[PDB]
């Protein structure tokens, strides 16, 4: 295909492409409102956490570090937040 609209790519194409290689450089990570069932409050966890995220006074461990997107403990709900 000769005539590609490089000005205006479809969102499907930029969601596919590497974060650095997009028309405008955009991260694939995000922050998320995470809450454990014991404690009241909601901690903001980073998707690719890479640390053992504890709640206040260690009510429980929330997020265990992995290769990429860090796994949340079984019983901990999350909502990804945007602006």
């Amino acid at each position: 295909p000769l005539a590609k609209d490089l000005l205006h790519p479809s969102p499907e194409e930029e969601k596919r492409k590497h974060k650095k290689k997009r028309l405008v450089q955009s991260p694939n990570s995000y922050f998320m409102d995470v809450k454990c069932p014991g404690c009241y409050k909601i901690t903001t966890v980073f998707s690719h956490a890479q640390t053992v995220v504890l709640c206040v006074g260690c009510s429980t461990v929330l997020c265990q570090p992995t290769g990429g997107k860090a796994r949340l403990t079984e019983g901990c709900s999350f909502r990804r937040k945007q602006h």
Binding site: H18, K19, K20, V24, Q25, S26, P27, F31, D33, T43, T44, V45, F46, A49, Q50, T51, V53, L54, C63, K81, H83
Partner: protein, 149 residues
């Protein structure tokens, strides 16, 4: 590509276009700076401070919340260590390899990887001397490199 490896990796972070603080984050610049001072005094590095912050305190960048970056915040109060933390970790790695070579004289690949870490230290050493954050009469001395943890 990499400095002392044939690797040609494209693994860096990608900051978002918008430099604005988000809606959800209510933390004042002072509160973040007071938390940075609480983390730095606990025996932590600007690399580690930035991680511990952006994991469990929902802070994208310190430079976006505050006006300034983390080593500059430690420096302005007087908590930043004498020699930079990236040159610290290279010297620390070099000491650990040169400690490994005290028993394993046959390990020619460790000796080769030492000459690479040596070369990276001398290369930062000369950089930090041009930017005047190291004194010019400083030297990576393998005798007194073990003296510096």
């Amino acid at each position: 590509g990499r400095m002392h490896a044939p690797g040609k990796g494209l693994s860096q972070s990608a900051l978002p276009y918008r430099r604005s603080v988000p809606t959800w984050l209510k933390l004042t610049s002072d509160d973040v700076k007071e938390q940075i001072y609480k983390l730095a005094k606990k025996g932590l590095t600007p690399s580690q401070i930035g991680v511990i912050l952006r994991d469990s305190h929902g802070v994208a960048q310190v430079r976006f919340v505050t006006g300034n970056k983390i080593l500059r915040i430690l420096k302005s109060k007087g908590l930043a260590p004498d020699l930079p933390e990236d040159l610290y970790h290279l010297i620390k790695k070099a000491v650990a390899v040169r400690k490994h070579l005290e028993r394993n004289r046959k390990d020619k690949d460790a000796k080769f990887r030492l000459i690479l870490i040596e070369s990276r230290i001398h290369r930062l050493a000369r950089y930090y001397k041009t930017k005047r954050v190291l004194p010019p009469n400083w030297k990576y001395e393998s005798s007194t490199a073990s003296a510096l943890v």
